[PDB]
Amino acid sequence: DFKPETWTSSANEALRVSIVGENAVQFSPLFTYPIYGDSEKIYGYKDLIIHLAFDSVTFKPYVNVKYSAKLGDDNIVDVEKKLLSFLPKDDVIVRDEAKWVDCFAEERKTHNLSDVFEKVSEYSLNGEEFVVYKSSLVDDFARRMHRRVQIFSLLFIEAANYIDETDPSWQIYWLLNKKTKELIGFVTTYKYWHYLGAKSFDEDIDKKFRAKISQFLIFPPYQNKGHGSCLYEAIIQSWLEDKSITEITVEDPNEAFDDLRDRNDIQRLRKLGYDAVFQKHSDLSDEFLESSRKSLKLEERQFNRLVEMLLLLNNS
């Protein structure tokens, strides 16, 4: 039977994203619209399969496009060229799998992020150690890596955009398996000047900042194991220690990030003894609440949600 409808496919299904370590782990993107258009459909290819694959350590990318047949046409999109335009120029291996393997084998011999970058913290999870590193985006090595993983922001975070790597206010956190050196996820963060009024600004020469979580990603093979929470806590803790940071903020968080943030913030509050503080009848002077929120470095809206929650939760 003639099925010309099979020459039109879902971009989300055709695109096979693979992270290759000891094994090839394959999964689907959540979004393709910034690559293949708003309908996320591809026309003119029968049995289309788009392989996008990354070494689990170096994230050296590989692209291979396959189909049983294709409409020779100019109106027909060049699927491969499209995808390559969102990947680093001349850093992607095309079709030749053996060539790709030879490449990242040699790279794995060279230095890890953990040799170049600044170490932030460590944690154990599932009976395994992980390390959080941070870096700027001006570093040539950090740029090489961030260009490799960038596309994951487009494929997994709605309305993501590629950030300005020339902007020195960008700081990136890298989550690594400590023994295997595999990249578990990454977080792009930014700092904005925080004006605290003339008196404060005139009194301290040291610039103050609101730190912002922008793109927060744990790769799909590694999700739902606690990594998101641990990484979030690692970053927040380093920001609590950073004198220049006044507030922790997040860019357009989704529901899943909302819940992660709330769960960790609450747990931090209880740990610091704030269950005993936030009671209906506690002394809660305006300057104490101000002092409290600043100590906590919590964003104002988030702070109020949290206090309201604690009042309701321990009551009731």
């Binding site: 000047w193 925080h194 009024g197 003339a198 610039k207 609101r210 912002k212 357009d252 809206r301």
Partner: protein, 366 residues
Amino acid sequence: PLSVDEEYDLWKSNVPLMYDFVSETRLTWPSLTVQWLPTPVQELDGGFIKQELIIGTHTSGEEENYLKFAEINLPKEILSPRSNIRITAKYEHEEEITRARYMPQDPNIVATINGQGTTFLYSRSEGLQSTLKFHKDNGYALSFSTLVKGRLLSGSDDHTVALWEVGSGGDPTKPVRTWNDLHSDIINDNKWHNFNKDLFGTVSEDSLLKINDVRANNTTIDTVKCPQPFNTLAFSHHSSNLLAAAGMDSYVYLYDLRNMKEPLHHMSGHEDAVNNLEFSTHVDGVVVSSGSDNRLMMWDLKQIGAEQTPDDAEDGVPELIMVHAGHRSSVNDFDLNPQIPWLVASAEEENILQVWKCSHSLPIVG
């Protein structure tokens, strides 16, 4: 893709929700300049509140030019609707008035600069008093010190800056200091600091911003390379270290005098060159800008970097408080009323003067 007139009509339909008050007036000739006088609020018979405004003409050589003083009689609710407006004095002026500024310590005195760079001193009660000739070309830069009576700075398309002292006695018609060495192109603006009586800033088409001391032999204490030329700058009325500057690239930049090496931040919103900038005297952190995109924008520096919801971020950066889209051509000048917080007068290229106050429901007015 609304035309200018379709967008105006849309703006007009939303005025009752966005504003406590808007008055719109067509002038017979454009004014290149706008400034509220510091006349104290006074309620008149009929329940109107008197304020006063300085404007000028630009007749393009067709008729006599005039420095004008207007009585703006506002509805009483403006303090918490329509106004009467009355031109109470007109004084003949040589060429167009590009800038007119009252002397803070004696607002009977008003300085002007014209299309040939000549500076004049006018008395409200007696008319033209003095002609201060140094600059040889059109000048847009003119600023009186709030800290030293009669200390006046002017700057010109001829690349030169002059310091005048017109508040003492004696003859004020000769500059006390001049600079041919500050900039190598048009002086776009010069302004006095609000706390250090000896500090002023200049911006030029040569893409430099300079911080200067009138006492120093070498003058300049800091030199800043501007991304593209700045047209204007302004100093905080609350912080002795904070200033703003803006121009061709459309962004409003903030600077710390203690470390001019790089901007604190830049605020995006304008879609064309920014031409004027002012800090609020009433609220620490509030900045207002105008530009060639026909807009005025009000900014809250205390919201820079604030967290937003996605729908909120779609309307602009958090520091953006409000956009005035009442004008249908580039904004020539605007002034924040020093007696009535949030009252603004702004004039556009095509003969319109608007007097307006944003909604008191906006969180920033509290």
